[PDB]
């Protein structure tokens, strides 16, 4: 509709003026601008309600499932006969449905309101973990690899960032089995080498210590808890097919470039302060330059709107970051867990970056990407945030230039700068 309006107005102006590019830019008279017919205890309660807001989906789903389950088991008491009896007794598919009541469960419902000081918060937190086991497992795997830097703990995060975060809203059963069996194998081997009969040690990750199993019972238990929950609820060449199903499909479209670039900016803040706070500085300067390079490449991939390019770049990025961080740097300088908490934190922020890019690759770019990240609503906050974003050196500089280089435009650079400055001032 907007383009219909604009083309109508342009046709009217052409007809009126009826009565080779610089000529069309330098064609403006006053006949354009003439009127076209004008056409404090409550903080814990707030935290609990916010957690319930996060987990309302699983709460309602579990309520429906348990309401069904009570009648299901009370009928199963005798034999268990008809699948249609359990549905219609109290329309096969519908998310949130309401029918007659059962006295026992409705009596049990308000019992939680009896305990409301902290027990509500504990229940909400546990239910949040139950509603995000899929993310708890990724966080535990990444944390385990953040300590005990070793290839044995490096083959798994590469999988998490390359395969489990790209397939299908349910990462396939083969992946969970792979991670569970692999952590079985690589805790059994660690324990076997923990024996005293056997004498690189650190790189292969089979070293012997007092805490030889570190965040490895937690990782195994998280994997198994997720498998159990995904089992009780729900359902539990080839590479080319995997890629082709990744590209061509119907998906929701979401944009997370704001957060992706925000994670990269936090990452450079981390590099700057771990350079100033302490060899490795000769590694973090090169890493700072590569951060600039990967921000520029990511910005180009975003403007040009290529999901395939993002997939290739994210594979390259995850492989290169892991290999570099865990082999190249620990040889040029010290271990990454003995010291360099800055390195641990930088890796964690880059892991958030990788998860966001994987989500963006799964969901595919939307339409309507242009327009500033802060100028959607003219409230009293967007103005201060926009002024602050303008105040930092060399962003609007680079934002304007990179937005020009990769957008399809007919304007030269000076004209582009004029348009962008006019828009900033007018906003």
């Amino acid at each position: 509709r907007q383009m219909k309006r604009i083309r109508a107005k342009q046709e009217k102006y052409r007809q009126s003026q009826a009565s080779d590019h610089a000529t069309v830019i330098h064609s403006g008279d006053y006949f354009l601008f003439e009127s076209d017919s004008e056409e404090g205890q409550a903080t814990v309660d707030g935290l609990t309600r916010w957690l319930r807001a996060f987990t309302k989906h699983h709460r309602t789903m579990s309520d429906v499932l348990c309401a069904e389950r009570y009648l299901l088991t009370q009928e199963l008491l005798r034999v268990g006969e008809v699948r249609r009896g359990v549905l219609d007794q109290l329309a096969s598919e519908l998310l949130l449905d309401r029918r007659l009541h059962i006295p026992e469960l409705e009596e049990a419902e308000r019992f939680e309101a009896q305990q409301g000081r902290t027990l509500r918060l504990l229940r909400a937190g546990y239910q949040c973990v139950a509603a995000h086991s899929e993310l708890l497992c990724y966080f535990i795997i990444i944390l385990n690899h953040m300590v005990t830097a070793s290839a044995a703990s490096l083959v798994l995060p590469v999988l998490v960032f390359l395969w489990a975060m790209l397939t299908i809203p349910r990462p396939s059963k083969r992946f969970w089995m792979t991670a569970i069996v692999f952590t079985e194998v690589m805790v059994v081997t660690k324990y076997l080498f923990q024996f005293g009969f056997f004498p690189p040690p650190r790189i292969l990750g089979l070293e012997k210590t007092d805490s030889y199993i570190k965040y490895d019972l937690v990782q195994l238990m998280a994997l198994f808890f997720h498998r159990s929950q995904l089992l009780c609820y729900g359902l539990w060449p080839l590479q080319r097919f995997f890629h082709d199903i990744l590209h061509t499909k119907y998906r929701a479209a979401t944009d997370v470039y704001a957060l992706m670039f925000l994670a990269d900016i936090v990452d450079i803040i981390i590099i700057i302060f771990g350079f100033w706070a302490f060899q490795v500085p000769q590694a973090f300067l090169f890493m700072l330059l590569v951060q600039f390079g990967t921000m520029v490449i990511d910005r180009a991939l975003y403007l040009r709107k290529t999901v395939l390019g993002k997939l290739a770049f994210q594979v390259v990025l995850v492989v290169a970051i892991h290999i570099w961080m865990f082999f190249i740097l620990p040889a040029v300088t010290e271990r990454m867990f003995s010291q360099n908490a800055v390195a641990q934190l930088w890796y964690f922020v880059k892991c958030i970056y990788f998860a966001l890019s994987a989500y963006q690759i799964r969901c595919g770019y939307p339409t309507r990407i242009l327009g500033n990240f802060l100028t959607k609503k003219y409230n009293h906050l967007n103005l201060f945030l926009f002024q602050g974003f303008r105040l930092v050196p060399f962003l609007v500089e680079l934002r304007a230039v990179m937005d020009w280089v990769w957008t399809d435009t007919t304007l030269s650079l000076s004209n582009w700068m004029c348009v962008e400055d006019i828009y900033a001032n007018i906003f």
Binding site: H380, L383, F384, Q387, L391
Partner: peptide, 21 residues
């Protein structure tokens, strides 16, 4: 004394020098 609007519009005129209206 003070307020919550006072600091807010102090910040407004402190970003009002550098930037337009």
């Amino acid at each position: 004394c003070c307020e919550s609007s006072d600091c807010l519009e102090i910040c407004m005129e402190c970003c009002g020098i550098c930037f337009p209206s």
